[PDB]
Ligand binder design. Structure first.
Ligand SMILES: Nc1ncnc2c1ncn2[C@@H]1O[C@H](COP(=O)(O)OP(=O)(O)O)[C@@H](O)[C@H]1O
Ligand SMILES: [K+]
Ligand SMILES: [K+]
Ligand SMILES: [Mg+2]
Ligand SMILES: [Zn+2]
Length: 531
DNA sequence: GGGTGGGTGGGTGGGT
């Protein structure tokens, strides 16, 4: 990674043009960090990689150089919805751009072939899928014609991490992308990513056939964000009631995002907020372009106070004054929580990132991520983050990214740093042994136990055929019992067993590998609790 | 409801 500070200047022959395009066309006041340096490197004909979180402004760094020189710019995008979002943004600004996919019509494809070789074409950005590069020789001929006529001089690889076989959502089409730099060397290539391991980025640089390439990585810590974990109520109605209470009592008239586990939860939370007077709008990638346009127009003009989105893909929400991000359910991974909560506070003002931790959300996500080879591990990391009540949230978050060393002070910007409290290590070893006895009783009865049935047997509820006479009621609230069960499952005293049924995958609880260590009577299991 | 209607339709429609 060569030093980007040498490029944070406007002494280049194109500096006036760059400033003109930034202020008069894009209607932005100031450059965000690493934007000017990456744009200057791209205009210098040098290859560059930009590791910037989602919502940071990665698109501008390749959209602006296109306007700073004659001709268009080729963009490689893996999804069509992303191309549509970029096209909507560019059409709102009056910039001529186009896209090509497998579902495009013949007349549109032929028009693109004509505009690529047109001398007086107004096109500046052409988004295409990698299949159009790999499985279209005619498009390759038109691309060569545009290269030889100096119709395009720069290439943008959105989600460049996909070129690596190690990167997320690797595409076999992405394997062939080295032909781009192999056939058109005079075109400066800029790769963009938000999820970037160092080895992954080096592998992508190898695949794209790039020898020297600057690599600019944005800062990890965001000093203006406040992180907090709250308990998710057992019912779904008091949850919306408390959400409305918070929104009206702390963020009255302030914009916000609500992330839901399922798209159905997103729609339901939208309906509940609307019935309770909160101006809400549902958003996800499955929306039609007309619905997306209407919700985005309502969001920009502040007609909608809260955008309720799904976590799976709802990533068209670009607004700098996001004052609060509320997670209806916990995120699937720590990387996902960082990327999803980072949407707030892009105006560098104080923002809140609240997460409601629910016991059932654990298993709801566990059943979903069963095919992922390491999904249970990331979900358990998220669970351990939620369980903690003393440790700083920034330390817990930085521990999950080995690629970054973050030593910035929290400065009372997390729930645990505040609330100056004192803690004990409550023993739960007898509770663990009682739960193990229940599991053995169920195992000899040839019945599988969901977490609900296990907690019902622990409390003395449910059907009496699942009972053990030696187990005493823990005389504790249900949320504390759920926390105790979660502590046992994380420490591998309990394990998850997945059953594949016709409607969905179900999660059951079984005796973990460490339960045998309970044979020692002196063995102790402790958990942090406030005094 | 019926499961010879199908699993991307969605479990929160309901009941198999
Ligand atoms: N210098 C800037 N100042 C203010 N807002 C910016 C700046 N650069 C980008 N933005 C805004 O940030 C939003 C999100 O950027 P986006 O294109 O989503 O980046 P990414 O490629 O990382 O997703 C855009 O809507 C854009 O208006
Ligand atoms: K049905
Ligand atoms: K059915
Ligand atoms: Mg993007
Ligand atoms: Zn802190």
């Amino acid at each position: 990674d060569s030093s980007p500070a040498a490029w944070n200047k406007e002494d280049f022959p194109w500096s006036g043009k760059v400033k003109d395009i930034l202020q008069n066309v894009f209607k932005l006041e100031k450059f965000r960090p690493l934007q000017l340096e990456t744009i200057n490197v791209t205009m210098a004909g040098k290859e560059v990689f930009l590791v910037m979180p989602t919502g940071g402004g990665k698109s501008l760094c390749y959209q602006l150089p296109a306007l700073c020189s004659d001709g268009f710019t080729l963009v490689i995008c893996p999804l069509i919805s992303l191309m549509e979002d970029q096209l909507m943004v560019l059409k709102q600004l009056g910039i001529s751009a186009t896209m090509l996919n497998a579902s495009s019509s013949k007349e549109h494809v032929k028009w693109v072939h004509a505009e690529m070789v047109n001398k007086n074409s107004e096109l500046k950005l052409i988004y295409v899928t990698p299949e159009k590069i790999a499985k279209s020789k005619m498009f390759m001929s038109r691309l060569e014609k545009a290269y030889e006529a100096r119709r395009f001089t720069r290439i943008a690889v959105d989600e460049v991490h996909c070129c690596s076989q190690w990167g997320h959502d690797f595409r076999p089409d992405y394997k062939a992308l080295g032909i781009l730099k192999r056939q058109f060397p005079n075109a400066s290539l800029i790769g963009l990513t938000a999820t970037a391991t160092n080895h992954v980025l080096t592998d992508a640089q190898k695949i794209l056939c790039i020898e020297k390439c600057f690599t600019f990585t944005a800062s990890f810590n965001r000093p203006n964000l406040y992180y907090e974990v709250r308990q998710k109520p057992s019912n779904t109605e008091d949850f919306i009631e408390d959400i409305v209470k918070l929104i009206n009592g702390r963020y009255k008239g302030q914009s916000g995002i609500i992330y839901c586990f399922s798209q159905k939860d997103s729609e339901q939370v939208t309906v509940s907020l609307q019935n309770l007077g909160i101006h809400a709008g549902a958003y996800h990638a499955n929306l039609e372009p007309e619905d997306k346009t209407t919700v985005h127009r309502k969001w920009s003009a502040n007609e909608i106070q809260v955008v309720v989105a799904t976590v799976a893909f709802g990533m068209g929400i670009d607004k700098p004054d996001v004052r609060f991000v509320i997670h209806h359910s916990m995120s699937k991974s720590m990387e996902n929580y960082y990327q999803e909560s980072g949407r707030a506070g892009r105006d560098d003002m104080k923002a809140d990132c609240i997460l409601y931790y629910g016991f059932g959300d654990i298993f709801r996500i566990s059943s979903m991520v069963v095919m992922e080879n390491v999904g249970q591990q990331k979900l358990y990391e998220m669970v351990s983050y939620c369980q903690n009540i003393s440790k700083c949230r920034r330390v817990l978050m930085a521990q999950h990214f080995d690629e970054v060393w973050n030593s910035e002070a929290c400065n009372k910007m997390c729930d645990n740093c505040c609330k100056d409290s004192a803690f004990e290590r409550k023993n739960i070893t007898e509770y663990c042994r009682d739960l193990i006895k229940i599991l053995k009783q169920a195992e000899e009865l040839n019945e599988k136990l969901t977490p609900l049935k296990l907690i019902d047997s622990w409390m003395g509820k449910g059907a009496a055929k699942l009972r053990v006479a030696g187990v005493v009621a823990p005389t504790l609230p249900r949320e504390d019992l759920e926390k105790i069960i979660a502590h046992f499952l994380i420490q591998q005293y309990l394990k998850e067993d997945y059953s594949f049924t016709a409607y969905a995958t179900i999660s059951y609880l079984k005796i973990g590998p460490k339960a045998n260590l309970l044979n020692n009577e002196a063995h102790a299991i402790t958990m942090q609790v406030t005094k």
